[PDB]
Ligand binder design. Structure first.
Ligand SMILES: [Mg+2]
Ligand SMILES: [Mg+2]
Ligand SMILES: [Mg+2]
Ligand SMILES: [Mg+2]
Ligand SMILES: [Mg+2]
Ligand SMILES: [Mg+2]
Ligand SMILES: [Mg+2]
Ligand SMILES: [Mg+2]
Ligand SMILES: [Mg+2]
Ligand SMILES: [Mg+2]
Ligand SMILES: [Mg+2]
Ligand SMILES: [Mg+2]
Ligand SMILES: [Mg+2]
Ligand SMILES: [Mg+2]
Ligand SMILES: [Mg+2]
Ligand SMILES: [Mg+2]
Ligand SMILES: [Mg+2]
Ligand SMILES: [Mg+2]
Ligand SMILES: [Mg+2]
Ligand SMILES: [Mg+2]
Ligand SMILES: [Mg+2]
Ligand SMILES: [Mg+2]
Ligand SMILES: [Mg+2]
Ligand SMILES: [Mg+2]
Ligand SMILES: [Mg+2]
Ligand SMILES: [Mg+2]
Ligand SMILES: [Mg+2]
Ligand SMILES: [Mg+2]
Ligand SMILES: [Mg+2]
Ligand SMILES: [Mg+2]
Ligand SMILES: [Mg+2]
Ligand SMILES: [Mg+2]
Ligand SMILES: [Mg+2]
Ligand SMILES: [Mg+2]
Ligand SMILES: [Mg+2]
Ligand SMILES: [Mg+2]
Ligand SMILES: [Mg+2]
Ligand SMILES: [Mg+2]
Ligand SMILES: [Mg+2]
Ligand SMILES: [Mg+2]
Ligand SMILES: [Mg+2]
Ligand SMILES: [Mg+2]
Ligand SMILES: [Mg+2]
Ligand SMILES: [Mg+2]
Ligand SMILES: [Mg+2]
Ligand SMILES: [Mg+2]
Ligand SMILES: [Mg+2]
Ligand SMILES: [Mg+2]
Ligand SMILES: [Mg+2]
Ligand SMILES: [Mg+2]
Ligand SMILES: [Mg+2]
Ligand SMILES: [Mg+2]
Ligand SMILES: [Mg+2]
Ligand SMILES: [Mg+2]
Ligand SMILES: [Mg+2]
Ligand SMILES: [Mg+2]
Ligand SMILES: [Mg+2]
Ligand SMILES: [Mg+2]
Ligand SMILES: [Mg+2]
Ligand SMILES: [Mg+2]
Ligand SMILES: [Mg+2]
Ligand SMILES: [Mg+2]
Ligand SMILES: [Mg+2]
Ligand SMILES: [Mg+2]
Ligand SMILES: [Mg+2]
Ligand SMILES: [Mg+2]
Ligand SMILES: [Mg+2]
Ligand SMILES: [Mg+2]
Ligand SMILES: [Mg+2]
Ligand SMILES: [Mg+2]
Ligand SMILES: [Mg+2]
Ligand SMILES: [Mg+2]
Ligand SMILES: [Mg+2]
Ligand SMILES: [Mg+2]
Ligand SMILES: [Mg+2]
Ligand SMILES: [Mg+2]
Ligand SMILES: [Mg+2]
Ligand SMILES: [Mg+2]
Ligand SMILES: [Mg+2]
Ligand SMILES: [Mg+2]
Ligand SMILES: [Mg+2]
Ligand SMILES: [Mg+2]
Ligand SMILES: [Mg+2]
Ligand SMILES: [Mg+2]
Ligand SMILES: [Mg+2]
Ligand SMILES: [Mg+2]
Ligand SMILES: [Mg+2]
Ligand SMILES: [Mg+2]
Ligand SMILES: [Mg+2]
Ligand SMILES: [Mg+2]
Ligand SMILES: [Mg+2]
Ligand SMILES: [Mg+2]
Ligand SMILES: [Mg+2]
Ligand SMILES: [Mg+2]
Ligand SMILES: [Mg+2]
Ligand SMILES: [Mg+2]
Ligand SMILES: [Mg+2]
Ligand SMILES: [Mg+2]
Ligand SMILES: [Mg+2]
Ligand SMILES: [Mg+2]
Ligand SMILES: [Mg+2]
Ligand SMILES: [Mg+2]
Ligand SMILES: [Mg+2]
Ligand SMILES: [Mg+2]
Ligand SMILES: [Mg+2]
Ligand SMILES: [Mg+2]
Ligand SMILES: [Mg+2]
Ligand SMILES: [Mg+2]
Ligand SMILES: [Mg+2]
Ligand SMILES: [Mg+2]
Ligand SMILES: [Mg+2]
Ligand SMILES: [Mg+2]
Ligand SMILES: [Mg+2]
Ligand SMILES: [Mg+2]
Ligand SMILES: [Mg+2]
Ligand SMILES: [Mg+2]
Ligand SMILES: [Mg+2]
Ligand SMILES: [Mg+2]
Ligand SMILES: [Mg+2]
Ligand SMILES: [Mg+2]
Ligand SMILES: [Mg+2]
Ligand SMILES: [Mg+2]
Ligand SMILES: [Mg+2]
Ligand SMILES: [Mg+2]
Ligand SMILES: [Mg+2]
Ligand SMILES: [Mg+2]
Ligand SMILES: [Mg+2]
Ligand SMILES: [Mg+2]
Length: 150
RNA sequence: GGGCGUUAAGUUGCAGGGUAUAGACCCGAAACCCGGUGAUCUAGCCAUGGGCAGGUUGAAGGUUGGGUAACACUAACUGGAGGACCGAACCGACUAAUGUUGAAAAAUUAGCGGAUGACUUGUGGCUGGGGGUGAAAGGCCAAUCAAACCGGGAGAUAGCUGGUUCUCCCCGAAAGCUAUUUAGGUAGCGCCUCGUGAAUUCAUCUCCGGGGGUAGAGCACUGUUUCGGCAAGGGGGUCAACCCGACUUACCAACCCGAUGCAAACUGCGAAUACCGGAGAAUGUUAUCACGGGAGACACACGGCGGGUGCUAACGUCCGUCGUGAAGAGGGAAACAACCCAGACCGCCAGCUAAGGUCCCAAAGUCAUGGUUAAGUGGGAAACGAUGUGGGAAGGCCCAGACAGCCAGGAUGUUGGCUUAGAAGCAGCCAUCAUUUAAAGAAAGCGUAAUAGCUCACUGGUCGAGUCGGCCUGCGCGGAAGAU
RNA sequence: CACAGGUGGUCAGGUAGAGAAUACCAAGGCGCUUGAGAGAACUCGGGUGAAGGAACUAGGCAAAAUGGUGCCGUAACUUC
RNA sequence: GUUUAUUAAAAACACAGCACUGUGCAAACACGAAAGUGGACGUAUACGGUGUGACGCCUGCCCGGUGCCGGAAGGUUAAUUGAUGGGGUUAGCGCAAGCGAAGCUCUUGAUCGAAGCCCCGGUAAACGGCGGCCGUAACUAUAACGGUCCUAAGGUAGCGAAAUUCCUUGUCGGGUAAGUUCCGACCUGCACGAAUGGCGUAAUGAUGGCCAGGCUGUCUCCACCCGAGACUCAGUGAAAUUGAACUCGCUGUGAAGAUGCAGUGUACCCGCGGCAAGACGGAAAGACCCCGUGAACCUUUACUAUAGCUUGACACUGAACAUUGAGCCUUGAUGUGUAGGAUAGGUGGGAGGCUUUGAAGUGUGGACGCCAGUCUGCAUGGAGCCGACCUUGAAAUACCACCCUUUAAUGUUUGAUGUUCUAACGUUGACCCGUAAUCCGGGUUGCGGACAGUGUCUGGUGGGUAGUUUGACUGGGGCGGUCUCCUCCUAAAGAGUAACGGAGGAGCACGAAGGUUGGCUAAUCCUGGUCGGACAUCAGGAGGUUAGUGCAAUGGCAUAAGCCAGCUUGACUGCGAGCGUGACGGCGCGAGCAGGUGCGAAAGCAGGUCAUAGUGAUCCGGUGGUUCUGAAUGGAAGGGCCAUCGCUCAACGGAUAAAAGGUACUCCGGGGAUAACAGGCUGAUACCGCCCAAGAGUUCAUAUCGACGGCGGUGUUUGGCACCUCGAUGUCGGCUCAUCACAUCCUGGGGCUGAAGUAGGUCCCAAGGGUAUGGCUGUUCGCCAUUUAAAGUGGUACGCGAGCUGG
RNA sequence: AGGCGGCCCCCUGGACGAAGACUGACGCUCAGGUGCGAAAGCGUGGGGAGCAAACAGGAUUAGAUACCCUGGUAGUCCACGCCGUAAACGAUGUCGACUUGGAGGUUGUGCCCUUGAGGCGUGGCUUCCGGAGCUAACGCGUUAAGUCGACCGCCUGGGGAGUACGGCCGCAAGGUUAAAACUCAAAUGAAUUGACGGGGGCCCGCACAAGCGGUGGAGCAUGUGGUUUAAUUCGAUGCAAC
RNA sequence: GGGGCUGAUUCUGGAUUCGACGGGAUUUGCGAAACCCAAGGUGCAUGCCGAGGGGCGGUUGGCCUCGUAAAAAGCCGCAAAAAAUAGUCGC
């Protein structure tokens, strides 16, 4: 009885180029967090290591049904996965410059928990001009509706 | 074929046991309802009268004047508004003692608040009970109020309570089953009576006919579990400490073999008793079922016995089976319904006896031979101790002098290096074999800078009868501290 | 009940006081329907107290103490 | 200011000020069934209802629940409404069945029908409602911060250990020598809050809490004195109580704490004044607690009613016009199956009544208009258009018209909104008159008018008003749980046999999963083999009931009662001796026999399932059969018998067609049959002693503690039992006094010591003497101040109310 | 001075000119005082169409408690009261005297034939240029920020702070007067030169759409990034490299 | 403290994250640790004595080598910090 989660504060920040739809591997005492709607995907960026992708930093919180006692950790290098013909080429995409690949949403389709994947660009950035083209398009079309009609 | 009848003499009286409908054995409710009666107190209200002694405080307005151009504002003066103050009569009831079959079924005493107001008050009219009135407390409406009081249906009703009065004689229960808006009541049965009718009927018991699955027992099986052999392969290697790993102890590991367990929801075993059914002797008031009259009771405790609950705790709970209590007096357990003995027809200044007792209170063995106790246990309770004891079976020393006495010897190797601080036995693991054996410890025990030592272990010697220490026992000592 | 009870209106004398309060008095009234005796504990109503002052205790309840006019003097605070 | 007279003056109530809402005056509302009467001889700046309470600053979010307001397209529906239908009567056909015309009937209820409700918005100064969880900052501290789930929406203005805050005496500070109260702040507000009002606030309060001065018998600790009682003498002279008394102490027993019992100790009989521990002292049939299928009031969306309040029907109740509804004078009369001069003939005869029982041209004013055409009318003419068909699963709008999925005029025909009028009625409008009368009647006129208001019926509404249920069981009640039925065990070897004792199940499934006939016979493990895989299909081997029974558990099963295949229906009709089974109701087992089966050839077998669970009394009604009856006869609308339907009536042998709560305003009947305090009885837990040695303590078990475990004691603390007490012993603390125990707090004696001495530790003895004052708190306890030789642990109805305080 | 905006009536302040007569400095400034004083806000009542904070909803939004839309209450309106701050700006206190011009616009007046809208004059207010001269300049510039006089308030660097205490002032909101410790050494007005603008106009270039090709699709030639590496020896590391 | 509710959108039922990871099966080829024999190739050979090793050390008690007695190996410790792009920013 939980709905589709999100980590929306990335899309108008980075550059998103090509998208991939991963799976996970949940590691022992911490799944009903997602079933209840408790999550933290704050600054979750997949460090590619050993040909074996991991999520780190994300604080999926423990539940309260499972006693909060012999539970696992909120943050853990959780071993992500995804099909070989989709994984085995993205190293050449991501391993060049100040790139990481992030998590996007811990949604679930096909009765099954997921995580999204998309290659990112950088933060040391004048990230202005395509937040400027919006007000150099909306005001422009208002001005030219005014001009063409009026 | 069955089921229900024809084997049936019934009515109307009178006495009577019940059941029925009427209050239905009697007294006893809070209330519910129908008529009535009350607003002399009180609750509000209404018309018409009265009361408020004495002091204070000084509002508004008004002047005499400043103030401005008027106003505003302001100075003293007058004027006396107030749910204003202090404090009488009057009200009111806050605090405290007294008084509580007091003086009074709500008050005295001493302090207290309001006291020209939403006041108080005289007298008189109005408001009716599921109604009034209410600064509204569920307070008040005649000392009574979450529906006043007075008659009536009222003999409301009470499945609950206490009482029910003359005598003798007979028999004599139950506290259980089921079912209950049912647990405290009643019904049907089971149990006691009174009458009728009927059979060796039932009852006790020897032999005989049988079905059991309790106790006890047993582990193939449901399931349990300890250990060895058999044990795959393992997280441990002492050793790589990079390795294909030098691998093996207080480790686990299969359906496995051998042994041992336990057990209400385990049984291939299995009584004792209990019960039903036949055959037979005696015996008893036919004690037995069948019908009929009338019950009572359905709140049971203990005590033993096999058991669920509880802590093998209760004068506990809840059932089985039996005795007693209830419903049972008598004796003894000091008294003490249940315990142990025992059934009170009645009288006797009559004998025998059960249980329990036989010094005295007090009725009887100061009896006997044989023991045990020395603790006033007997006269309140143990895990545990012990040269207290009494008995018995041993076992090893025992006169080729041993048991404690009493006297001597008690070591070289070896301070073993160590590791402490010096390490001889001493602070500490090792090997303590052995030189030299009459016999003597790389040390049994102390100590402190180590020490230095010290005895002893273990023998020799002296010395002239029992020991020395383990079991089994009856009796007993301590542990054994409570409130008048 | 010959009961510390309960009810309204009319008149207010002297003397110190603001005054019908209170005090002592007049005119008028009554002296309280059981009385005598002794001077215990104790109860009630009462007076004062060495020294300490709330230690008492639920809490200064009670008691004590203040108390009248004239004049001086009089805060934070306020809707003045 | 004022209230519980007769225990409560307060923080209660009431007030002015405000906010809303109702009310157009015959008000609105209330009492009275009505007449009227208040409101008010007033008129929205007035009155009623409710909410909070002066002013000062302030009064935030939410309309989902709930109510109220408006709105009416649809759903929804009474009273009326009887069209259709459905079943019996009887003229008559029935030779005898059966159909059965009108009439009276009995039944079913299409159709017209308002409010309400469903629905549409609003409104919180209407009832009310106002969240979680998680993450980072400069590691410490939180988190402005993002995350994301639900609601209608997340408590903002101010406040906050408070009159509210348990844990809690939260923390810190001031006040104190010390402060569970107080005062200030702080947030972590279990469970503050904005008109059931928040935070301030001067003034007052017989007010709640607290601190200081001055004061004192309030106190340490009382002393005299002043009186009235109390005491003796004289006079009068009572009550509440009482089974009876020749009425001692202790220990034990005992419906369990003795003035009476058993033992023992002590006591000359009898007064007088005091004291109040005991006679469970005296009063008030215990009010707390609960059983009662007693009782009262009270509430709400508990049950049915019911005053009112509203909605419609008809009557009181009337006429013309606009709109009507079916009707109401004759049939015009429409017509596509892809088929097509294209507007086609239900059964039926097969082709013409016409043609003077008077047909069309052509232009085109209506109309079916997929332009194919047409229902074409008729405004000046004196006359022949169609029929088989051309495409024919269905031949002509060429020839009857019982006249239709389809439609018109002219009059007739009645419901509603319309409108107007007055004659019914209202007039608590005006004026005159009875007359001396503001009522009443009568008249004059004016206004309103078929509304309104009444009656009967009916719908929605409705704690304003009344009647009552609200179950029992229980190791006291409520709370929870349980209640029927099935098997085991408890169940003590026949049957039976308890608890809120132990573990489970069931409210069905099966037209085959039943029937007979013939067969067939298990899991498990190993070997071998294709994708074979850890367990599939196959072959053998062991295996020997360790599998399976449509489901729980037990007892069975191999002749199988399991697993297949073949047949087709005995999961039969009427009976049933004779038994097991319960109190009965009643469920259970059936051999054998009559009818007609099935299976197999036959002897034989089947009245269910391998058995035990899978259900429900009675009434009340509907259906079918029913030569049972049939209120005079003959029928039947109805009643019997037979088959059979509608219950989680589950509290299951069922008090009703349907039923929750509060009482500390309380009331009656009872009981220790059952509670709270106390007594008794256990004694696990508590406490206090002992026992075993891990070890600590430098070496060294016991100077001194002792983890692992043991035995035992007193009868104190928390608990269990329900014996005594409910026609009543009063219960926490403090104030007052003594007494006893001894497991000792000092004083006293001694031992051992990691005891040098001062002092210590810890046991052996010993109860005779002593055993504190303050603050906080009700407190005992507790904390702390500060003493002290020490400030003992306990029992004694947690000593002590016929002696007091009453916090 | 804020402010003042249809039309009319009533009542009324003030200005400016005509040509005189008139009293003779009665005049100027003014701390404190008194009075007015936008809009907002507050109190009492009213009326409340539109508009429209807080408020609700939709979005835009990485977020949006805003800009946009959709609705909508405080208020804006009236009357009577207090408030007494505004960029209450011409950021220029009041009164005077003088110092060259022009172009307007407003209103009043004298004369000439105004035959017609005409001609030159003196007035009054106001706008725009602009000389002398002054200001850092910007600019003002007979209405001065020029030349002088008469008083009057006001400043002594920015923050702190126009804040706190305290007094007055009112119901309040806060108006009213008005410190300091401390802490930087700049804040600051004009101008100029760059650069930039989601400011402007104007212009270019295969930079743009017009059209043609291939890149990016799979392989394959070349280089690089990274991954591996005893090492694969360095550099080229968006635009300007592969 | 007891009592109820919540423990994956199956809630009396049968996962398909097609999701590179750990463990298993099938298809597959040539090295002896996946397997074996001395003929097809071939000489001074095997082992027990005994002895030794990369500026330096270690392991299988042993991997190259050696004949009456001494010189040379694959991997591990002391050390090229063998961080390559470092986490999301400016200083
Ligand atoms: Mg028969
Ligand atoms: Mg007779
Ligand atoms: Mg009789
Ligand atoms: Mg009074
Ligand atoms: Mg009082
Ligand atoms: Mg007074
Ligand atoms: Mg007064
Ligand atoms: Mg009350
Ligand atoms: Mg009374
Ligand atoms: Mg009454
Ligand atoms: Mg009554
Ligand atoms: Mg009667
Ligand atoms: Mg009676
Ligand atoms: Mg007898
Ligand atoms: Mg029952
Ligand atoms: Mg009974
Ligand atoms: Mg009873
Ligand atoms: Mg008899
Ligand atoms: Mg057994
Ligand atoms: Mg009989
Ligand atoms: Mg009885
Ligand atoms: Mg009983
Ligand atoms: Mg019994
Ligand atoms: Mg017994
Ligand atoms: Mg027993
Ligand atoms: Mg017992
Ligand atoms: Mg008992
Ligand atoms: Mg008996
Ligand atoms: Mg007896
Ligand atoms: Mg005895
Ligand atoms: Mg006898
Ligand atoms: Mg004799
Ligand atoms: Mg005697
Ligand atoms: Mg004798
Ligand atoms: Mg003798
Ligand atoms: Mg000797
Ligand atoms: Mg007097
Ligand atoms: Mg007298
Ligand atoms: Mg005296
Ligand atoms: Mg005195
Ligand atoms: Mg004196
Ligand atoms: Mg004194
Ligand atoms: Mg004190
Ligand atoms: Mg004290
Ligand atoms: Mg006092
Ligand atoms: Mg006094
Ligand atoms: Mg008062
Ligand atoms: Mg009163
Ligand atoms: Mg009272
Ligand atoms: Mg109030
Ligand atoms: Mg609404
Ligand atoms: Mg609502
Ligand atoms: Mg309607
Ligand atoms: Mg509100
Ligand atoms: Mg609102
Ligand atoms: Mg942090
Ligand atoms: Mg609290
Ligand atoms: Mg406080
Ligand atoms: Mg509140
Ligand atoms: Mg509220
Ligand atoms: Mg005597
Ligand atoms: Mg006694
Ligand atoms: Mg007695
Ligand atoms: Mg006497
Ligand atoms: Mg006496
Ligand atoms: Mg006395
Ligand atoms: Mg007494
Ligand atoms: Mg007595
Ligand atoms: Mg008594
Ligand atoms: Mg009683
Ligand atoms: Mg009673
Ligand atoms: Mg009237
Ligand atoms: Mg009621
Ligand atoms: Mg009950
Ligand atoms: Mg209970
Ligand atoms: Mg049995
Ligand atoms: Mg038996
Ligand atoms: Mg079957
Ligand atoms: Mg067969
Ligand atoms: Mg079955
Ligand atoms: Mg008939
Ligand atoms: Mg008949
Ligand atoms: Mg008849
Ligand atoms: Mg029943
Ligand atoms: Mg019934
Ligand atoms: Mg009794
Ligand atoms: Mg009892
Ligand atoms: Mg009893
Ligand atoms: Mg108690
Ligand atoms: Mg008790
Ligand atoms: Mg005992
Ligand atoms: Mg114990
Ligand atoms: Mg020692
Ligand atoms: Mg010891
Ligand atoms: Mg008692
Ligand atoms: Mg009692
Ligand atoms: Mg009594
Ligand atoms: Mg007390
Ligand atoms: Mg002692
Ligand atoms: Mg000693
Ligand atoms: Mg003593
Ligand atoms: Mg003594
Ligand atoms: Mg005792
Ligand atoms: Mg006591
Ligand atoms: Mg005591
Ligand atoms: Mg007493
Ligand atoms: Mg009290
Ligand atoms: Mg002149
Ligand atoms: Mg000034
Ligand atoms: Mg304004
Ligand atoms: Mg207004
Ligand atoms: Mg818009
Ligand atoms: Mg200013
Ligand atoms: Mg300006
Ligand atoms: Mg200025
Ligand atoms: Mg100015
Ligand atoms: Mg110029
Ligand atoms: Mg200047
Ligand atoms: Mg100037
Ligand atoms: Mg300021
Ligand atoms: Mg520049
Ligand atoms: Mg620029
Ligand atoms: Mg082009
Ligand atoms: Mg590219
Ligand atoms: Mg390409
Ligand atoms: Mg390079
Ligand atoms: Mg270089
Ligand atoms: Mg390049």
């Amino acid at each position: 009885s939980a709905t589709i989660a999100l980590n929306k504060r990335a899309r108008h920040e980075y550059f998103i180029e090509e998208e991939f739809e991963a799976g996970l591997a949940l590691q022992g005492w911490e799944v009903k967090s997602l079933r209840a709607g408790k999550a933290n995907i704050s600054d979750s960026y997949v460090l590619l290591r050993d040909g074996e992708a991991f999520l780190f930093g994300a604080n999926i919180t423990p539940m309260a049904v499972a006693s909060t006692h012999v539970v696992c950790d909120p943050t853990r290098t959780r071993k992500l996965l995804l099909n070989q013909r989709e994984l085995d080429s993205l190293y050449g995409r991501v391993n060049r410059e100040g790139y990481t690949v992030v998590a996007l949403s811990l949604y679930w389709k096909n009765a099954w928990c997921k995580v999204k994947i998309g290659v990112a660009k950088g933060k040391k950035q004048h990230d202005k001009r395509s937040d400027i083209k919006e007000r150099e398009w909306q005001v422009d079309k208002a001005r030219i509706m005014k001009n063409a009609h009026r």
